[PDB]
Amino acid sequence: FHSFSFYELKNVTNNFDERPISVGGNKMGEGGFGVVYKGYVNNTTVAVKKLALKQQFDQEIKVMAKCQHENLVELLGFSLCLVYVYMPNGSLLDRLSCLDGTPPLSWHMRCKIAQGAANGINFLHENHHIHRNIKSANILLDEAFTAKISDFGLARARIVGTTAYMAPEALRGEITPKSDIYSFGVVLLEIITGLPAVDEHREPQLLLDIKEEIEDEEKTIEDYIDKKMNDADSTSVEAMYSVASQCLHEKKNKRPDIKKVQQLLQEMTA
Amino acid sequence: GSRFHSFSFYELKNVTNNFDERPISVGGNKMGEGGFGVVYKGYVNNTTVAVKKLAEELKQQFDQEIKVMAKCQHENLVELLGFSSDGDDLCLVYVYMPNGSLLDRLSCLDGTPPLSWHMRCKIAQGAANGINFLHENHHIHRNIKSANILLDEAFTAKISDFGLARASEKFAQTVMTSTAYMAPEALRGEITPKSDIYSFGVVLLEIITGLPAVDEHREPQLLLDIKEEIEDEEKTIEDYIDKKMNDADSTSVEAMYSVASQCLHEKKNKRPDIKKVQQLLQEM
Ligand SMILES: COc1cc(N2CCOCC2)ccc1NC(=O)c1cccc(-c2ccn[nH]2)n1
Numbered sequence: 245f246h247s248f249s250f251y252e253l254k255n256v257t258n259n260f261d262e263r264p265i266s267v268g269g270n271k272m273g274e275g276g277f278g279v280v281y282k283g284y285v286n287n288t289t290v291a292v293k294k295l296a297l298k299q300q301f302d303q304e305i306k307v308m309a310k311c312q313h314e315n316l317v318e319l320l321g322f323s324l325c326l327v328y329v330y331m332p333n334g335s336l337l338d339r340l341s342c343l344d345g346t347p348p349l350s351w352h353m354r355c356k357i358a359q360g361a362a363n364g365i366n367f368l369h370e371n372h373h374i375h376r377n378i379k380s381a382n383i384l385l386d387e388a389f390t391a392k393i394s395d396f397g398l399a400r401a402r403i404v405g406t407t408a409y410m411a412p413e414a415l416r417g418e419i420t421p422k423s424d425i426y427s428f429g430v431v432l433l434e435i436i437t438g439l440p441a442v443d444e445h446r447e448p449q450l451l452l453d454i455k456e457e458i459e460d461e462e463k464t465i466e467d468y469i470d471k472k473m474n475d476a477d478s479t480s481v482e483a484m485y486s487v488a489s490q491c492l493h494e495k496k497n498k499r500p501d502i503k504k505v506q507q508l509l510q511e512m513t514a
Numbered sequence: 515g516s517r518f519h520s521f522s523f524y525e526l527k528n529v530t531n532n533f534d535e536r537p538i539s540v541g542g543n544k545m546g547e548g549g550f551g552v553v554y555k556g557y558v559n560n561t562t563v564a565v566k567k568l569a570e571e572l573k574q575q576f577d578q579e580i581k582v583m584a585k586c587q588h589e590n591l592v593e594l595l596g597f598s599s600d601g602d603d604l605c606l607v608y609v610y611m612p613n614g615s616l617l618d619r620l621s622c623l624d625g626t627p628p629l630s631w632h633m634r635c636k637i638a639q640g641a642a643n644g645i646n647f648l649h650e651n652h653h654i655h656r657n658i659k660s661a662n663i664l665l666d667e668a669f670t671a672k673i674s675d676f677g678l679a680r681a682s683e684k685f686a687q688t689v690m691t692s693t694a695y696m697a698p699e700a701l702r703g704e705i706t707p708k709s710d711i712y713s714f715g716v717v718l719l720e721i722i723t724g725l726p727a728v729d730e731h732r733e734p735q736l737l738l739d740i741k742e743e744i745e746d747e748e749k750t751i752e753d754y755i756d757k758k759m760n761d762a763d764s765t766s767v768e769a770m771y772s773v774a775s776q777c778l779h780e781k782k783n784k785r786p787d788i789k790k791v792q793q794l795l796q797e798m
Pocket residue numbers: 265272273280290291293317328329330331332333334335338344381382384394395
């Protein structure tokens with residue numbers, strides 16, 4: 245890694261200009277733990293996450309020091325700010341919602357993204373880490389649309405997480421990689437549907453609840469498939485939905501482990 | 515709380531031997547403790563009473579317990595006599611429940627006899643009747659646990675600890691979360707009576723098994739997780755029945771377990787409401 249002065253990071257982000265990119269500012273995204281800014285270090289674009297907590301900073305540095313992998317975003321350095329390699333296609337959330345005029349993700353691309361994200365999770369679990377905040381806002385996309393996991397402030401070798409992605413045992417305070425599998429199930433539903441994980445104005449508010457609707461025949465998988473893609477065949481969509489459903493089991497021991505999820509996602513496109 | 519008496523802190527301090535924290539068994543005044551604080555043996559009008567000494571939000575809980583108790587009297591709810599707020603700490607004074615808490619009795623504290631199966635059935639049915647009264651009167655308890663089901667001389671179940679009770683439902687959920695009795699939707703921030711049913715399901719498992727809702731040294735740590743084991747046939751209901759009672763017929767116990775299992779559905783709309791629970795417990 246490398247040290248950055250706060251002076252430099254202030255300068256390369258137009259003094260942390262919080263206006264969105266689309267207004268001419270530097271803000272690319274925000275969450276409960278900080279704001280992510282576009283920075284220009286000489287000829288290079290970087291992503292600068294400014295936190296807004298110290299233990300999360302230290303923890304993210306720790307985990308990122310220990311965990312480097314092709315489906316994890318690379319941390320360039322630190323200042324509280326964290327500096328990362330810029331991911332030009334932004335977050336999976338932003339692409340699923342077609343923000344900033346981008347075209348919809350194809351089904352083929354969505355499948356490869358699911359596989360890449362699963363590969364990142366597998367690396368984490370092989371190395372005895374739990375992410376604890378898997379969600380579509382934290383899956384970034386490079387120029388090839390390769391999926392890379394970020395946001396490691398909550399990672400682990402005080403109950404905290406993103407409510408709409410949290411397994412019941414995680415909500416109760418258990419620490420297990422099986423909770424990451426559950427969260428990934430919600431991401432798979434986002435990939436299939438193009439809908440957000442929670443929407444207060446929607447029935448059901450939580451996306452994870454469409455599993456129950458489908459099982460009860462109040463809705464079907466077809467009712468929920470993203471209408472904006474045109475290369476999505478029923479067999480593979482139902483295969484992905486099957487993986488998602490399995491990941492969303494209420495009981496941790498009944499969920500597939502990440503290697504099984506990888507197998508199923510491979511067989512989906514095989 | 516005009517229904518109740520105001521007691522001075524000085525008198526309560528006096529009659530509890532200056533809040534003597536040693537247990538009753540050695541001549542002190544401490545009867546138990548919880549997240550609310552500590553419950554002491556005291557006296558008013560030459561009568562033994564329970565004195566809960568609580569330990570901005572705390573005052574809100576105090577006021578809320580008083581408000582709920584003012585509104586709700588029933589065979590299966592504890593009775594508040596008065597309150598103290600004039601001294602160093604907030605106190606709530608209740609009618610004494612001589613057989614202590616369901617938790618005390620399930621764990622056989624001080625070497626008390628195990629509750630018989632018939633007594634357990636009476637307690638389950640009575641607790642359900644108390645919850646029904648609350649729900650009929652549009653209250654959500656939010657804190658149903660074996661530690662706050664108290665027991666009179668007839669081993670009648672009396673629900674206590676209304677400081678977190680609510681009288682309005684809410685369905686919005688937290689965006690970021692920043693438990694052994696809590697339903698998933700409650701953990702997500704909803705306020706609904708259906709969550710009380712889930713908590714009651716855990717209490718029913720405690721009644722059947724004699725086990726605590728959570729045990730760090732046990733597999734599984736959470737009692738609610740035994741539902742999975744039984745469904746997998748890795749364990750049977752009989753494997754879990756409290757071995758310390760001897761009048762428990764298998765059919766009745768399995769029926770109570772069925773009620774508990776139904777109460778513990780992960781999805782609130784698939785759980786029975788309290789009136790259905792009452793009915794099933796009567797059929798049991
Ligand atoms: C929402 O984050 C981004 C959005 C974009 N968009 C911005 C709008 O125009 C298209 C590209 C481009 C890049 C990013 N993010 C990154 O390059 C990046 C790199 C490393 C971590 C993170 C991140 C996002 C949330 N937590 N961590 N983000």
